[PDB]
Every structure is written in C-alpha cells, then in structure tokens.
Design a protein around this ligand. Structure first.
Ligand SMILES: NC(=O)c1ccc[n+]([C@@H]2O[C@H](COP(=O)([O-])OP(=O)(O)OC[C@H]3O[C@@H](n4cnc5c(N)ncnc54)[C@H](OP(=O)(O)O)[C@@H]3O)[C@@H](O)[C@H]2O)c1
Ligand SMILES: NC(=O)c1ccc[n+]([C@@H]2O[C@H](COP(=O)([O-])OP(=O)(O)OC[C@H]3O[C@@H](n4cnc5c(N)ncnc54)[C@H](OP(=O)(O)O)[C@@H]3O)[C@@H](O)[C@H]2O)c1
Lengths: 333, 333
C-alpha cells in the first residue's frame, strides 16, 4: 500500500477504509473547502486524488502534480476537470455514475412536486403560526397548484438520470417527451417516451426537467428565448448544473409570469445568493443535495475506492471517463 | 329554478353557474368560515346545502333546517356530517370522491419525498442566505436523507387515494404493503401489493402512509404503541385526517427518535398550532391542501352541482354517501 492518495473531503468511511489497505491515505477535514494554495501544495507528491466539484482540476493543478496518475471525482459530473489535458498527460479520470442515479431522480421529482404544489410556502404558513393567528381554516384558492398526474413532462437529457426520471413519470401516468443528444428508440418503446425537437418540447411540456451535463453546448441552454417558448403554466426543474440555465433570464421569466415556477438544486455559483430569486415564492431551492441519500453517498464512496484499487492493480477503472487514455499509458503507478 | 341552495364558501364559479340555472343560489363570501350563529340562521329556509369540512352538520343544524333535503360536501370525507341522523330524516348526503384522487395522491408523494430529502430545510438554508454567508459549498453529510426508490411503502387504507398512491409507488419500484378494512386481491395481483396485519406493516415499512377516513375505529390509530413498532429510519405521511394520529405521541416519537420524520397535511384542529411540533426540522407541514390543484377544485365544483341537479330532477345523486336514504324518501324537493 505504498501509493499515496489525497482525498479533498471527508467522504464515507467505508471508502476511506477500503483505500487505507492499498494506499497511504490523507483526508482533508476542515469545515471549508480546501484552499487553492493548499491544494497546490498537497498534490505535489500524490499518485492519486479523490476530488469534489469544489476543486478545479485544471492545467495549473496538473503542472503542480508530477506524480499524479489518476483523479477520481466523487460526483458523476466532471465539468470541474480538464479532461483533455488529463488524457494528454496519461492521467486517468473516473466519476461515480449509476450509484447516485436513484437519489438524484428522487430529488428531481421531490422538487417537481414541491414546486407544483407549494409545499415550502405551505409549510412556512403553518409553521410560522400564520395559519392559526389569522384564524381562517381553509380557502378554495389557497396554495392552488398544478396537477402532475397525466400531465406532460419534457426531459432534456435522456441519460442515466433522465431515464430514471422518466420511469418515475410513468408512475404518474405522464405523457413523456424528451430531447437529447442521442435518440434511444428502445427507451421510446419501453416507456412510451417521444422524442421532440427542443423547441417543441418546450412548447408542449407542463414540466421541463434538465438532466444534461455542463458543456459548451449546454451552457445557458435555457435562455430568455427558450423560456418564452414554455407554457405560462409550466414549471422548470434543474438538477443538472446551474450554468445550463441563464439565471437572470429565469428570474425575469418568473417575475413576468412567462412560466409558473422553478425547482432548482444547482446554481451558477455555489454557495449561491440572489436576492431577486430568493424573494419569489414560486421557486423551491436546495443546496446541490441531489445525491444526498444514505445509499448514494455510500455507493459513491465504494465506487471511488474500487476505481483507485483497480487502477493500482493494473486494471482499467470501472467508471473511467477518458478511455482514450488507456492507449496513452497503461494503468498502474 | 325555485329550489334554494346555500353554499358556505366561494367554490369555483363553474359549479356556482351550473346551480344558478336550477336553484336560487347564495354564497358565503367572508374571509373567515361562516359563524355557527349565522349558519343556523341561513339553513332555516334552504332546500339544499353545499358545505365545507369547517361546518359541523349535526343534529342541531338539522333541527334548524326544516326544508333541508340534501347536503353536498365539497370534500370526499364526511366526518363533519351526522350521516345517521341525516338518513333518518330522509336527507341525502353527497361528497366528492374520485375527482380529487390524483391531486391528493400527488401531494402525498410530495410530502413523502420532501420529508425524506429535507427539501423544506434545504430551501430555508439557501433562501435565508445562510448557505452563502457561511461560505461552505458542500459537505457529504448535509441534508443526508432517505432513499425512496426500491424501498418499502406501507399504505394504511387501500381505497381510492390509497390505490392512487400505490400506482405512483410502482414508478419508484417500491415494495408495496398495505393494511385495509377490505382486502383487494385484484389490486394485490396488478400492483404486486401485499396485505399485512397492521403490526407487521408498521415493522416492515420505510414509509407509512395514512389514507383512511376518520371514524371511531381509526381515531388515534397511530398511537404511542404503534409508533414504537415502526423503524427508527421510517417516515410517517398523513394526508387522511389529523385525528387518525395521536399528535402528542407523534411529537414524542420524533423528539425521541423512534421514527425519522413525518409529513402532515392534516391536523387534530384546523387551523393548527403546536410549538413543539413546529420546532422539529424533520417534519413537513401543509394546511390541508391535498385537493388544492386547479383540476381537483374544478372537478369538485362540477360534481357538487351534478349531485344537486340530479336530485332536483328526481334522480339518485351520482356520489350519494347514504344509499339507505333512498328507501326512506325518494329523491326530489
Ligand atoms: N444535482 C445533483 O446532485 C446531480 C447529481 C447527479 C448528476 N447531476 C448532473 O446531471 C448530469 C447528467 O447525469 P447523468 O449520469 O444522467 O449523465 P449521463 O447519463 O451522461 O446523461 C446525460 C444526458 O445528457 C445528454 N446530453 C449531453 N449533451 C447534450 C446536448 N448538448 N444536448 C442534448 N442532450 C445532451 C446525454 O446524451 P448522450 O447519449 O449523447 O451522451 C445524456 O442523454 C451530470 O453530468 C451532472 O451535471 C447533478
Ligand atoms: N388531505 C386532503 O386534502 C384529503 C383529500 C382527500 C381525502 N382525504 C381523506 O382521505 C380519506 C380517504 O379518502 P378516499 O377517497 O381513499 O376514501 P375511500 O376510497 O373510502 O378509501 C378509504 C380506505 O380506508 C379503508 N378503511 C376504512 N376504515 C378502516 C379501518 N378501520 N381500518 C383499515 N382501513 C380502513 C377503507 O376500506 P374499505 O374498502 O373497507 O371501505 C378504504 O380502503 C377521506 O375520507 C379523507 O378523510 C384527505
């Protein structure tokens, strides 16, 4: 167990214990994210790294990590890693797909329902004592929300999570529409999902759900132009990446009533603060807790360890993101 | 259109307009529920009544309503009406089943997911600016919640809404258990639901959902004894009636960690206020908004009108609750 690995956050002990028997492990345990200056210091002697989205693994990090051969992201997304640069350097990059699919799909529906039915607003009304203080038991128009069952859901990005969201949508007998980079006729057949050009999906959906990774092509995909295409009664749900949505445009759309509401788990900056957005009572916000379930956190921890241990043994990591690297340099330290 | 009807709340205009062409309609439009003294005054000359749960239609009301022949509840529950007394007097009682089934089942799942994943707590954390102010982007243990997909759901009361909840549970690939007064083998076959004695359902469920009406038999069904039977990681969801749950016992169970959390849409008194309950961050509360969807409210309004108009025409109301009354007195004014 001579290989050295530095883990940038206190992930589940199950994964740390698996790594301890194969690597010399070090784990960042401060309350705040590891400072850039300290990260550059820590990567100087490591053979492997386990990172969070908060760490920008760019060329500067690689230039300061001469022994680094594998970076395991404790996340399924990898927009925080310069994949092209890594591959060029023969550095393997892994992520945690599948093990967090159901937790994120569950949260996506939690936001869809909470936003559609004003659960957060209702909770505040009761909990604050306003309900009792005002002395009125019920009104027909109070917290009047949108039906979900039988309605149309438009999923943008029909990947691992997009499909999981579609499976749940069938439990609500919804009409499923989707727009994605790759068409999946088999999924279309099995779930009765129907492919639609982005423009038509936006016009026909009662609920628009974002499940695409952040790339040059998805950056601000949902802009002012597209928000205007959506139904005024439609709700936008984002569990993908904040930068996939033009926040200023979204806030404008909500204030002007172009759409009915939005449920967001991701933002353009994290932590995030936007006074105008936070004033709106037709939005539901969560701090990137998509994979925050006991099962997901554990699976992610075990998967990160599996990838590093497989690599140490000269095997191809199970969830390698840049497979071209294999031809550049064979696995191992 | 000589029959007179008094409606105790401003329900959707679609229903009021349907009634206007067949009855002389009067609609209570004050901010607060109609006072008892005024209700007794108003029922003196009416032939029909459209009531909300806030109105207790007991013997005292009947004794003061000599012309009353039909009471249409704008609700599916009717624990606010003395059905036995009504029948005896030849008074027809109708409710609004089915038209609000999907809205309530949707809200039930909204609470299940919101409670399991700490959506309300997360929203407060972001919205209050605490997330940004503290400057920490993410922690592995923050808002750590329970997986829903593939977990076990125990539905108590497998009726219209209980079954709707089970259909949604299949979208989450859940193991479905149920305890109800009547066994439905066909539903067991179609949804893979499994009947279980109440005690076994409580011990085996990860999520316990209440969907039974309030009766002498369901009053405080979930008491201290039964809360102790549930898993310490289980969550209780109540969209039925508040009195089906011993609130003091529930608060004790939550404070002591007997169960993981609870999502409640109904309370023992409405409006409700309970300082100890409202302090708990593992509960989600909504003000009886189960049927608060545009579609449900409209369907309910049309159904109430359909029942009264059918009755006027000497027909049996579509959703008559006390069918024994037909033999007591034929329909009509
Ligand atoms: N909020 C959270 O906590 C959380 C949790 C997990 C994931 N996420 C986010 O969700 C993203 C997706 O996760 P996942 O595992 O489903 O990823 P995945 O299976 O790759 O799915 C991504 C989907 O987006 C499609 N796509 C990519 N670029 C597109 C474009 N330009 N236009 C239309 N569709 C495009 C992909 O198409 P292809 O078939 O062509 O590749 C695929 O269908 C992650 O990258 C991450 O950003 C967030
Ligand atoms: N929160 C809201 O806004 C909202 C909205 C709608 C309804 N509700 C509440 O939900 C209740 C149920 O509505 P629904 O239309 O599903 O009613 P429903 O079809 O009668 O369903 C009630 C279910 O409870 C069962 N049940 C009755 N007594 C029982 C007992 N002692 N033990 C076990 N099971 C028992 C019934 O069995 P059987 O087959 O034997 O009759 C039936 O399966 C309503 O009465 C109301 O109180 C609340």
């Amino acid at each position: 167990m001579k290989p050295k690995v530095f883990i940038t956050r206190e992930i589940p002990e199950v994964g740390i214990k698996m790594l301890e028997d194969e690597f010399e492990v070090e784990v960042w345990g401060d309350e705040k994210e590891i400072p850039r200056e300290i990260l550059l210091k820590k990567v100087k002697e490591v053979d492997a790294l386990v990172t969070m989205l908060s760490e920008r693994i760019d060329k500067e990090v690689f230039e300061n990590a001469p022994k680094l051969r594998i970076v395991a992201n404790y996340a399924v997304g990898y927009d925080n890693i310069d994949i092209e640069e890594a591959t060029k350097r023969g550095i393997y990059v892994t992520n945690t797909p599948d093990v967090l699919t159901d937790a994120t799909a569950d949260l996506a529906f939690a936001l869809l329902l909470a936003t559609a039915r004003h659960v957060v607003k209702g909770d505040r009304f009761v909990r604050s004592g306003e309900w009792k203080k005002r002395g009125v038991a019920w009104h027909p128009k109070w917290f009047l929300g949108y039906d979900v069952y039988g309605k149309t859901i438009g999923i943008i990005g029909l990947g691992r999570i997009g499909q999981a969201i579609a499976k749940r949508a069938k439990g609500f007998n919804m009409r499923i529409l989707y727009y994605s980079r790759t068409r999946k006729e088999e999924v279309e057949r099995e779930l009765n999902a129907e492919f639609k050009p982005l423009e038509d999906l936006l016009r026909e959906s009662d609920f628009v759900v974002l499940a695409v990774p952040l790339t040059r092509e998805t950056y601000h995909l949902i802009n002012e132009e597209r928000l205007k295409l959506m139904k005024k009664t439609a709700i936008l749900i984002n569990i993908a990446r904040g930068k996939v949505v033009d926040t200023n445009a979204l806030v404008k759309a909500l204030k002007e009533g172009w759409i009915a509401g939005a449920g967001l788990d991701v933002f353009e900056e994290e932590p995030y603060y936007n006074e105008e957005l936070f004033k709106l009572d037709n939005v539901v916000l969560t701090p990137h807790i998509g994979s925050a379930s006991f099962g997901a956190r554990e699976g992610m921890a075990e998967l990160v360890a599996k990838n590093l241990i497989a690599f140490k043994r000269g095997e191809i990591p199970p969830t390698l993101v840049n497979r071209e690297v294999i031809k550049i340099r064979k696995p191992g330290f």
